[model samples]
Target: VVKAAGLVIYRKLAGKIEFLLLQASYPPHHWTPPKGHVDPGEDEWQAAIRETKEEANITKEQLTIHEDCHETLFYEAKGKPKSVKYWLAKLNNPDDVQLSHEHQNWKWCELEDAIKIADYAEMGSLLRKFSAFLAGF
Candidate 1:
C-alpha cells in the first residue's frame, strides 16, 4: 500500500473558478493536482503542502487551505493499493507555476475541462465535490 496526499488548488478569475492541474512526465501521463507520496514521519497535511510546493511551485504562503474540506480516495496503481488524501485550497494570486521534473506541463482549468483532462471517474468526482464546497464560500 502507498499513501499520498495532494491539494486541489483553485483560483478566482473573472468571477469564475479555475483549478490547477499538472500532467506527469511519466507514462500514462496522467493529469492530476499536485501530489506525491507521504514522507516518513510526515502527516497527510504536511505531505500535501510539501508536494504542492515541489510539484507546482506554490507555497503555503500563496494558498488558503480549507482544512475542513478534505477527502480520500482508494485505488490500485501498478498493482499496489494506493490511498490518496486531497484537500481544497485557494491560490492567493494568479502566480506563474514552476513545474518540477515530475511534471511535463500545467494548466488552470474550469470544472468541465478539469474533469475531462483528469479522466479518472473518482478524480472527477472529487473535483466536483471540491467545486461544490467552493460554491459555499
Candidate 2:
C-alpha cells in the first residue's frame, strides 16, 4: 500500500456539525476530505497539517486536530495499492473555505448527510464514530 495522510475536518454551525468535503476535478469527482502525501521531512501529522493549509486554505491555527481519534483506510486504486491515515479535526472558528485548482468545489455536511456523500464507504463508519465522540462519545 501507499503512504499518505488526511483530515476529516468539521465545523459546528447553527444546528449540526458540518463535515468538510472537497469536489475533485476529475471523473466521478468524488467528494473527499483534505489529503496529501508526506514530504521527505514531514511526518504523518505534519503532512496533514500542510495539506489542510494548502488544499483548504485553512491553517493549523484555525483548526483543532484530534490525534487520538484517527483512522487509516486502505484499498487498491490502480495496480499499486493506496491508503491514507485520516485524523479528525474541528474548525475552531466558523471561517470561510477558499477553493483551489487542486479541487473543484466544497460543501459542509452533518453526520447523517455527510456519510451519504462521503466517497469512501468506511468513511461513513469513521465519521459516525467521530460524531459520537462529539456527542459525549
Candidate 3:
C-alpha cells in the first residue's frame, strides 16, 4: 500500500473563491494538488504540509487549515493500491505560487474551472466538496 497526503488550498479573490492545481513534472504529468508519499514516521497532516511546501512552495503558517474538511482518495498508481488523504486549507494571501521541481505549472482557479481542468472524477468531486466548505466561511 502507498500512502500520501495533500492540501486543497484555496483563496478568496474579489469575493469569490478559488482552488489551486499543480501539474506534475513526470508523465503522465497529471494535474493534482500538492502531495507526496508519506515518510516513515510522519503523520498525514505533517506529510501534507511538508509535501505542499516541497511541491508548491507553500507553508502551514501561510494558510489556515480546515480541520473538518478532509477526504481520503483510494486509487492505483503504478498498479499499487494508493491512498491520498487531503485536507482543505485557506491561503492567507492570494499570492503567486512558487512551484518546485515536482510540478511544472500551477494555477489558481474557481471551482467550476478547477473541476474542468482537474480532468478526473475524484479530483473534481474533491474540489466541489472543498468549494462547498468554503461557502460557509
* Top TM-score model: 1
lDDT of 1 by residue, 30-110 (tens): 999999899999999999999999999999999999998999989998799999999999998878899999999999999
TM-score for predicted model 3 compared with the true structure: 0.95
The residue ranges of model 2 lying beyond 4 angstroms of the native Cα positions read none
Per-residue lDDT of 117 in model 1: 100
lDDT of model 1 at position 92: 85
Task: Indicate the TM-score of model 1.
Answer: 0.98
lDDT of each: 0.95, 0.85, 0.88
TM-score of each: 0.98, 0.92, 0.95
lDDT of 3 by residue, 22-137 (tens): 99888898888888889989989989999998888888889999999999888988899999999999888755688887789988888888988888899888887877777785
Worst ten-residue run, lDDT, model 1? 128-137
Candidate 1, residue 23: the lDDT equals 98
